[PDB]
Amino acid sequence: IVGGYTCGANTVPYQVSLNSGYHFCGGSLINSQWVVSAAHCYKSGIQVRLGEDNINVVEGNEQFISASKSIVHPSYNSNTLNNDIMLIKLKSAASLNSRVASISLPTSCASAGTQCLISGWGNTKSSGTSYPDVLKCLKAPILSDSSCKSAYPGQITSNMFCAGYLEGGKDSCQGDSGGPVVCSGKLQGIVSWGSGCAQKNKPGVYTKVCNYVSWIKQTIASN
Numbered sequence: 001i002v003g004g005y006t007c008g009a010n011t012v013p014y015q016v017s018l019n020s021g022y023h024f025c026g027g028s029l030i031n032s033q034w035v036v037s038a039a040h041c042y043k044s045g046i047q048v049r050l051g052e053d054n055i056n057v058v059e060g061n062e063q064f065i066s067a068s069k070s071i072v073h074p075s076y077n078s079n080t081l082n083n084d085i086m087l088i089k090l091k092s093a094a095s096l097n098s099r100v101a102s103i104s105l106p107t108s109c110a111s112a113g114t115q116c117l118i119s120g121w122g123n124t125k126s127s128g129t130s131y132p133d134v135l136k137c138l139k140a141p142i143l144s145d146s147s148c149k150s151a152y153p154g155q156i157t158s159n160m161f162c163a164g165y166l167e168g169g170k171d172s173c174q175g176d177s178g179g180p181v182v183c184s185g186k187l188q189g190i191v192s193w194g195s196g197c198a199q200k201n202k203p204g205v206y207t208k209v210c211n212y213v214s215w216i217k218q219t220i221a222s223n
């Protein structure tokens with residue numbers, strides 16, 4: 001997260017860190033046994049770390065559970081990143097409480113101007129890699145579709161939305177992929193891509209979760 005602030009330990013209880021011997025992506029806990037992340041974060045050998053704040057120190061509240069299966073959306077296209085969503089079932093249910101809790105899925109899509117909270121342990125530099133030890137937060141508004149399409153002509157599908165600042169300086173970045181974009185207490189986006197990080201006129205692009213709610217519910221139901 002570039003231009004963000006330290007969230008404060010366990011202030012984002014649904015945030016998860018996907019770990020394969022190092023933190024590589026974020027994710028959101030939607031129920032005690034399932035996490036939603038981005039399909040481009042897929043890999044085998046994933047350990048889900050819940051209740052985390054400092055990813056390099058065990059401080060208490062952490063729960064490490066291995067993933068039982070990861071279901072990448074069947075229509076995920078790695079060249080366009082259309083349908084960039086993935087579900088991970090945990091080997092055992094997490095214990096929920098106030099430090100580890102699920103986030104609700106939306107009932108409607110959000111409109112441009114809605115302010116959201118994006119969080120993650122991704123890069124905090126737009127020029128260079130500086131990964132933090134504690135969770136960073138950023139408040140960003142969803143942008144209108146014309147500003148999003150004028151920024152990435154021909155690369156935005158109806159399953160994506162832009163959120164951020166066209167003046168640059170504040171944005172999500174590598175390491176934040178798979179993480180949550182929460183607006184009014186609902187998970188509305190998943191950190192997906194962008195050109196560079198916090199660059200002028202190049203906002204972050206997020207998976208539009210309201211378009212996948214029936215899919216998420218049907219898939220969790222049949223698995």
Ligand SMILES: Cc1cc(Br)c([O-])c(-c2nc3cc(C(N)=[NH2+])ccc3[nH]2)c1
Pocket residue numbers: 171172173174175176177191192193194195196197198203204205
């Ligand atoms: C080289 C590389 C590899 C991976 Br894997 C990424 O997810 C990314 C990446 N760039 C990103 C840029 C943004 C942004 N909001 N500007 C968000 C996620 C990103 N993820 C970059």
Ligand SMILES: [Ca+2]
Pocket residue numbers: 052053054055056057058059060062
């Ligand atoms: Ca820790």
